[PDB]
Design a protein around this ligand. Structure first.
Ligand SMILES: OC[C@H]1O[C@H](O[C@H]2O[C@H](CO)[C@@H](O)[C@H](O)[C@H]2O)[C@H](O)[C@@H](O)[C@@H]1O
Ligand SMILES: OC[C@H]1O[C@H](O[C@H]2O[C@H](CO)[C@@H](O)[C@H](O)[C@H]2O)[C@H](O)[C@@H](O)[C@@H]1O
Ligand SMILES: [Mg+2]
Length: 237
């Protein structure tokens, strides 16, 4: 489209080795936005790895990944890189790069993901986001409501509430639906509505259709580390 994040291809890497995955940005000024990386282990689970500010090369990591992941950029080629060291089978996962905006603190454009397979073969301070239900089977046309509760208030210093909703359709990268509780992102239909305050938030879908099916994730970026809910799989009965 206008903006694209193009990640490198799938990687089959031996245990102990390192891998360096790339994310080429096109369609926007690379140095004007934070680039964030996310791990998704086989299923419904997004984890923040870290951020890089391409203008300075400055980084912040999720403690879980500090010592494991190294983020760099090449400004001349508008490319972000994530290196992972001392690889084991636990690193096998899909990795995404995503652009983070300032106005929403939300992840507005995502890479397509890179699958890493690590094999020898030939071919309580963090804020917890509790999403319910974990599974929402419906009939087409039904209304759907998904809840997200945070362990601490999501109200930021500036009075805004950095609670966002993403939809990951089967086989695709997550996409931004709602930012800052209730703001629909460009292109998102009016059947989606977000509400709530403090610690309790709700995403409503007024009449479910096939394009709505997938896994919904809430996320908060008020607090560092950024965190994600466990997902709600919306599917047809
Ligand atoms: O809107 C993105 C930028 O926000 C800040 O900069 C703006 O707001 C500042 C006051 O908080 C003004 O002084 C500044 O002129 C504005 O551009 C932030 O400092 C920037 O890093 C962001 O790019
Ligand atoms: O009014 C609620 C709190 O607002 C601020 O703290 C929140 O926003 C911070 C980022 O600006 C977060 O790091 C923090 O974890 C949030 O709780 C303010 O600093 C707090 O004193 C207020 O309790
Ligand atoms: Mg400028």
């Amino acid at each position: 489209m206008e903006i694209q994040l193009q990640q490198s291809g799938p990687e089959l890497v031996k245990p102990g080795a390192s891998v360096k995955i790339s994310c080429k940005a096109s369609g926007y000024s690379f140095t004007d936005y934070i680039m964030l990386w996310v791990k998704q282990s086989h299923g419904k689970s997004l984890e923040w790895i870290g951020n890089i500010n391409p203008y300075y090369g400055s980084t912040s990591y999720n403690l879980k990944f500090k010592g494991k992941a190294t983020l760099t950029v090449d400004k001349s080629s508008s490319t972000a890189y994530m290196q992972l060291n001392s690889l084991t089978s636990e690193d096998s996962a899909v990795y995404y790069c995503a652009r983070k905006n300032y106005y929403g603190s939300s992840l507005d454009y995502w890479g397509q993901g890179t699958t890493l397979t690590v094999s020898s073969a030939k071919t309580g301070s963090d804020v917890v986001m509790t999403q319910t239900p974990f599974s929402l089977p419906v009939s087409l046309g039904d209304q759907a409501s998904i809840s997200c509760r945070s362990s601490q208030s999501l109200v930021h210093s500036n009075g805004n509430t950095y609670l966002h909703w993403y939809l990951q359709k089967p086989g695709q990268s997550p996409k931004l639906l709602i930012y800052k509780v209730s703001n629909r992102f460009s292109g998102v239909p009016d059947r989606f509505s977000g509400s709530g305050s403090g610690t309790d938030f709700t995403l409503k879908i007024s009449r479910v259709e096939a394009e709505d099916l997938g896994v919904y994730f809430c996320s908060q970026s008020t607090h560092v580390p950024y965190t994600f809910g466990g997902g709600t799989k919306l599917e047809i009965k």
